[PDB]
Amino acid sequence: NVTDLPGPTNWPLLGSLLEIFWKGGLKKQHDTLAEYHKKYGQIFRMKLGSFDSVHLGSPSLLEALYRTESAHPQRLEIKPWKAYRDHRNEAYGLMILEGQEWQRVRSAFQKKLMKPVEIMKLDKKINEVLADFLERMDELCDERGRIPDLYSELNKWSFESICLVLYEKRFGLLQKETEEEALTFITAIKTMMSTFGKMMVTPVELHKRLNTKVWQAHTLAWDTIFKSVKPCIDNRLQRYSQQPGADFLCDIYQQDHLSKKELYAAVTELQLAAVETTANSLMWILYNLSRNPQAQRRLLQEVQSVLPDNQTPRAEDLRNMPYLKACLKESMRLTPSVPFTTRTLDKPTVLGEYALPKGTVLTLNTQVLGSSEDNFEDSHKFRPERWLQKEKKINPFAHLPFGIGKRMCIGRRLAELQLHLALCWIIQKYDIVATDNEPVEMLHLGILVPSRELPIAFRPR
Numbered sequence: 223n224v225t226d227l228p229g230p231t232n233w234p235l236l237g238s239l240l241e242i243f244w245k246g247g248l249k250k251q252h253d254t255l256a257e258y259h260k261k262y263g264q265i266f267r268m269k270l271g272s273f274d275s276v277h278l279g280s281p282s283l284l285e286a287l288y289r290t291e292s293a294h295p296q297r298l299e300i301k302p303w304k305a306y307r308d309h310r311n312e313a314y315g316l317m318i319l320e321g322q323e324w325q326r327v328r329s330a331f332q333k334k335l336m337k338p339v340e341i342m343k344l345d346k347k348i349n350e351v352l353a354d355f356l357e358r359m360d361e362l363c364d365e366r367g368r369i370p371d372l373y374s375e376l377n378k379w380s381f382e383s384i385c386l387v388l389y390e391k392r393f394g395l396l397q398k399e400t401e402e403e404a405l406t407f408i409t410a411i412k413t414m415m416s417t418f419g420k421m422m423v424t425p426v427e428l429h430k431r432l433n434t435k436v437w438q439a440h441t442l443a444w445d446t447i448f449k450s451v452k453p454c455i456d457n458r459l460q461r462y463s464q465q466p467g468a469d470f471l472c473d474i475y476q477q478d479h480l481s482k483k484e485l486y487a488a489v490t491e492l493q494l495a496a497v498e499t500t501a502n503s504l505m506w507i508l509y510n511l512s513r514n515p516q517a518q519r520r521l522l523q524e525v526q527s528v529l530p531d532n533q534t535p536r537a538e539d540l541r542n543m544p545y546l547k548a549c550l551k552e553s554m555r556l557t558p559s560v561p562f563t564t565r566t567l568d569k570p571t572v573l574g575e576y577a578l579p580k581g582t583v584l585t586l587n588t589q590v591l592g593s594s595e596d597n598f599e600d601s602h603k604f605r606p607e608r609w610l611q612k613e614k615k616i617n618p619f620a621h622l623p624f625g626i627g628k629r630m631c632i633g634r635r636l637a638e639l640q641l642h643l644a645l646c647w648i649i650q651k652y653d654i655v656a657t658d659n660e661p662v663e664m665l666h667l668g669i670l671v672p673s674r675e676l677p678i679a680f681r682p683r
């Protein structure tokens with residue numbers, strides 16, 4: 223068939239853009255899609271307005287796509303960012319780069335942020351950050367052990383951290399009398415990150431022509447952002463000019479031939495695609511911990527066994543902490559920072575008892591895979607163990623917080639590194655206890671963030 227989908231009644235003009243609201247709206251989209259999947263099975267499809275797409279929610283369909291993968295996979299078109307690059311005449315980046323052009327840049331970095339021997343080498347820099355972060359932590363801690371604006375806090379950490387990795391400089395976000403251009407560049411990011419959203423459901427080209435107030439905002443946001451990044455990536459190059467092998471950036475710029483104009487673009491989308499996501503999972507892991515004392519116990523122990531005394535962690539030991547590394551796992555399978563990624567076919571393909579029309583929009587509901595009762599017994603349970611007892615099962619195509627395919631998360635490594643170190647110093651110097659036992663809903667706003675302030679307390683030892 224072709225119209226056997228099935229899916230939710232196709233109600234006039236809107237499509238399912240009805241229930242989607244008469245159920246919570248966009249911020250609860252992941253939930254309702256989760257139900258349809260429960261309903262209409264492994265695969266179906268819906269149309270929000272004139273937007274049509276088919277949802278994939280199974281380990282089968284996932285391999286049944288991984289294998290049929292193309293050389294240049296591609297997700298939805300982020301036209302607004304593209305619009306800006308063309309307008310202002312700037313390069314593109316792995317988020318929007320395409321086909322050959324993409325594959326080129328990917329390879330160059332891809333081969334350096336996903337190679338342990340290299341990533342692990344970030345070792346100290348991260349700790350330097352982790353250091354000042356905790357040093358500031360107890361200061362923010364009141365006496366109940368709580369932090370006001372935790373997310374905001376963890377975001378500062380992840381920002382400051384990744385920029386030490388990218389521009390090789392501290393921005394001073396972790397302590398007063400050190401902000402200013404720190405936050406203008408931050409706002410620029412925050413403004414830009416909300417505005418572009420509006421030129422997606424609306425004709426960016428139309429906007430541009432009318433020079434709409436919104437077009438101008440987004441423009442300026444990015445105009446600024448590129449002005450904050452450029453010099454940072456010019457100092458890093460002028461500094462490791464005659465020192466081959468040293469700077470991973472300067473090495474790409476020279477023996478992978480890429481223009482400063484391309485590096486600027488690539489780095490920036492790296493930062494953008496980094497920070498919040500990172501911070502976001504860090505917070506959900508903490509949260510899950512605060513709700514499972516036993517598992518936090520078995521975790522503390524493993525952090526004392528491998529680190530007797532309050533000594534500083536180091537990339538490596540992680541090899542000796544299978545419960546922690548898998549705590550971060552299960553955490554992501556129960557509370558994913560990212561619910562789903564999207565793909566575009568560029569050749570008709572086979573899925574379900576169906577075959578897709580080529581050029582179709584696919585929404586890989588990588589979330590739902592977490593409750594696949596056939597791969598996860600008691601899906602609604604935080605069990606860092608299932609990922610350890612080597613008697614288990616779990617086909618890699620059931621847990622994919624970083625996306626499947628070769629156009630999957632390029633950060634994954636360095637992300638997990640950071641989410642492994644910080645989490646050591648945390649569970650080290652602090653106990654993580656629940657401030658309360660009342661409901662906390664996940665809300666899609668780019669990445670599942672929580673409905674309210676996280677009810678978790680940081681009591682010292």
Ligand code: HEM
Nearest residue numbers: 316495496499500503563623624625626629630631633637
């Ligand atoms: C807990 C942290 C993170 C999660 C869960 C995560 C999530 C993902 C996911 C699910 C994708 C989509 C994959 C697909 O197309 O199927 C993605 C793409 C990507 N991520 Fe992350 N990410 C995180 C951190 C990082 C970090 C720290 C960086 C930056 C160095 C990074 C940068 C990117 C980039 C540049 C892409 C686009 C790659 C391309 O298609 O060319 N990520 N990420």
Ligand SMILES: OC[C@@H]1O[C@@H](OCCCCCC2CCCCC2)[C@@H](O)[C@@H](O)[C@H]1O[C@@H]1O[C@H](CO)[C@@H](O)[C@H](O)[C@@H]1O
Nearest residue numbers: 248412414415416417418419420422423666667668669
């Ligand atoms: O930019 C990330 C997300 O990507 C955006 O684009 C993809 C979704 C397309 C529908 C979005 C629009 C629907 C109605 C008009 C406004 C948003 C949306 O998810 C958007 O809500 C957006 O959420 C945005 O991220 C912010 C958090 O830093 C939100 O506070 C902000 O409102 C912004 O919308």
Ligand SMILES: OC[C@@H]1O[C@@H](OCCCCCC2CCCCC2)[C@@H](O)[C@@H](O)[C@H]1O[C@@H]1O[C@H](CO)[C@@H](O)[C@H](O)[C@@H]1O
Nearest residue numbers: 239248251270298300423562563564585666667668669
């Ligand atoms: O969260 C917003 C979107 O929600 C879904 O619908 C998006 C369009 C929203 C439909 C329009 C609604 C808002 C205004 C018009 C009426 C209702 C999916 O596309 C989903 O993949 C999602 O698409 C978004 O894509 C962005 C790409 O950067 C990311 O924020 C993220 O992938 C997100 O899912």
